[PDB]
Design an enzyme around this catalytic site. Structure first.
Site, short mmCIF file in Angstrom:
data_model
loop_
_atom_site.label_atom_id
_atom_site.label_comp_id
_atom_site.label_asym_id
_atom_site.label_seq_id
_atom_site.Cartn_x
_atom_site.Cartn_y
_atom_site.Cartn_z
CG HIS A 1 9.78 16.22 1.28
ND1 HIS A 1 9.43 17.49 1.15
CD2 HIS A 1 9.10 15.32 0.47
CE1 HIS A 1 8.37 17.32 0.16
NE2 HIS A 1 8.22 16.18 -0.14
CG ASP B 1 11.83 21.12 -5.83
OD1 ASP B 1 10.40 20.71 -6.39
OD2 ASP B 1 12.19 20.82 -4.63
N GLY C 1 1.02 -1.29 -0.06
CA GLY C 1 0.14 -0.13 0.06
C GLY C 1 0.70 1.41 -0.22
CG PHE D 1 21.67 25.27 0.63
CD1 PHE D 1 21.15 24.12 -0.34
CD2 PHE D 1 23.08 25.21 0.94
CE1 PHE D 1 21.79 22.99 -0.40
CE2 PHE D 1 23.80 24.00 0.64
CZ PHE D 1 23.39 22.80 0.01
N1 LIG Z 1 7.96 15.25 -2.85
C1 LIG Z 1 9.00 13.84 -2.77
C2 LIG Z 1 9.86 13.85 -3.73
C3 LIG Z 1 10.98 12.91 -3.93
C4 LIG Z 1 10.65 11.72 -2.91
C5 LIG Z 1 11.33 10.57 -3.15
C6 LIG Z 1 12.01 10.15 -4.51
C7 LIG Z 1 13.03 9.12 -4.52
C8 LIG Z 1 13.18 8.36 -3.22
C9 LIG Z 1 12.42 8.56 -2.33
C10 LIG Z 1 11.54 9.70 -2.08
C11 LIG Z 1 9.36 11.43 -2.23
C12 LIG Z 1 8.45 12.76 -2.09
N2 LIG Z 1 7.48 12.59 -1.28
C13 LIG Z 1 6.18 12.95 -1.80
O1 LIG Z 1 5.99 13.27 -3.02
C14 LIG Z 1 5.07 12.95 -0.79
C15 LIG Z 1 4.01 12.61 -1.13
C16 LIG Z 1 2.75 12.65 -0.26
C17 LIG Z 1 3.37 13.02 1.08
C18 LIG Z 1 4.32 13.48 1.75
C19 LIG Z 1 5.45 13.36 0.34
CA LIG Z 2 8.60 22.07 -5.94
NA NA Z 3 20.05 30.07 -0.12
ZN LIG Z 4 6.41 15.53 -4.37
#
Ligand SMILES: Nc1ccc(-c2ccccc2)cc1NC(=O)c1ccccc1
Ligand SMILES: [Ca+2]
Ligand code: NA
Ligand SMILES: [Zn+2]
Length: 367
Positions: free
Chosen positions: A135, A168, A21, A181
């Protein structure tokens, strides 16, 4: 002219599993790779397998304690680390799975390896679709991300570049990168994201940086349903102005695909062509460019998007008709590369788009 492209991929990536899930599916990176190989794009670029980034590498930004925890935590020992799990925000959105640390090492290794390649002037562009984990925080996992490969890659670029620009286009605010940063003028961060009761809750356009970094953080908050035209009206003018004022010598572009129409978690209405236009725009500045992945939860569209953006980086036209590939059934019922937007309402009026752009332009005059 045409650029040299180095591309990072480890075939083990598709085998990591966040659990039943969980919407993050590392398998999307293998789908992307398999698709672009079937379009013959391997012929035009150098394909590298990245090293596994070490704890030394990761602690260039992350705390020793956070990294030691990530190296130690396993599904079989979770019950013993219950406190530490809460402290570092692991075990929910960011679960403990088999090979978690190796997965962090692989996605990080590609970004850092690409940054070194750019620093040595041995490529014009480096691509790591497994990266873009924007994040992750110094001592905390967040939003499916554990190790911030982007901050690590930027720290690498700063060894040779006085000013690095980060852009981004993930639907979510790039909070981890902005945070790292926020107080320096050596990295300007520019994020376009949905804003308003939405993860992570940051990126108000009034968040502009602090101390030496004041005016070096740029945020463009958006509403549900933004489309190719609304986005295109704003992206090129903002990036051009940023380029003019900031004069970076290197650029990192996070191409998170959760801003596409039909994303399982996102609420934007961009097509692959609209998303890719952002890559085209950034490309025209002819600066050393690191292109990274990011979110994206409708995995067929993630594969299309990053395949097409690889083709864009290569200035290589590819047919809309999908070549046969190992995941051909995921691309039905159409089996085409490009996607259609949905009929969802765009809550972003043209007036709203122009007004936010105008406020951002005022801030950029302060540079
Ligand atoms: N925003 C983001 C960017 C890269 C990765 C990521 C890319 C590769 C490997 C691991 C994470 C994960 C995320 N997380 C989300 O998009 C998101 C969605 C719903 C709730 C909270 C966060
Ligand atoms: Ca963005
Ligand atoms: Na900066
Ligand atoms: Zn995202």
């Amino acid at each position: 002219a045409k650029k040299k492209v180095c591309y990072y991929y480890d075939g083990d990536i598709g085998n990591y599993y966040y659990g039943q899930g969980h919407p993050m599916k590392p398998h999307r990176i293998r789908m992307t790779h398999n698709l672009l190989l079937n379009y013959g794009l391997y012929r035009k670029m150098e394909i590298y397998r990245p090293h596994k980034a070490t704890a030394e590498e990761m602690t260039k930004y992350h705390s020793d304690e956070y990294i030691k925890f990530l190296r130690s935590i396993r599904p079989d020992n979770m019950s013993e680390y219950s406190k530490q799990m809460q402290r570092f925000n692991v075990g929910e959105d960011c679960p403990v799975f088999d090979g978690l640390f190796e997965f962090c090492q692989l996605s990080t290794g590609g970004s850092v390896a690409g940054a070194v390649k750019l620093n040595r002037q041995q490529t014009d562009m480096a691509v790591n679709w497994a990266g873009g984990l924007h994040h992750a925080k110094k001592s905390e996992a967040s939003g499916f991300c554990y190790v911030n490969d982007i901050v690590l890659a930027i720290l690498e670029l700063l060894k040779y570049h006085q000013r690095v620009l980060y852009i981004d286009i993930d639907i979510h605010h790039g909070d981890g990168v902005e945070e790292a940063f926020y107080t320096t003028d050596r990295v300007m961060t520019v994020s376009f994201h949905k804003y308003g009761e939405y993860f992570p809750g940051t990126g108000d356009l009034r968040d502009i940086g602090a101390g030496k970094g004041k005016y070096y953080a740029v945020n463009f908050p958006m509403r549900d349903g933004i489309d190719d035209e609304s986005y295109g009206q704003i992206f090129k003018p903002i990036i051009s102005k940023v380029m003019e004022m900031y004069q970076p010598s290197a650029v990192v572009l996070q191409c998170g695909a959760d801003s596409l129409s039909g994303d399982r978690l996102g609420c934007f209405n961009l097509t692959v062509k609209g998303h890719a236009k952002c890559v085209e725009v950034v490309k025209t500045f002819n600066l050393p460019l690191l292109m990274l992945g990011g979110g994206g939860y409708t995995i067929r569209n993630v594969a299309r998007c990053w395949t097409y953006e690889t083709a864009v980086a290569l200035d290589c036209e590819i047919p809309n008709e999908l070549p046969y590939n190992d995941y051909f059934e995921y691309f039905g019922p159409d089996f085409k590369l490009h996607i259609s937007p949905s009929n969802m309402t765009n809550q972003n009026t043209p007036e709203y788009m122009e007004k936010i752009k105008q406020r951002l332009f005022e801030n950029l005059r302060m540079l």
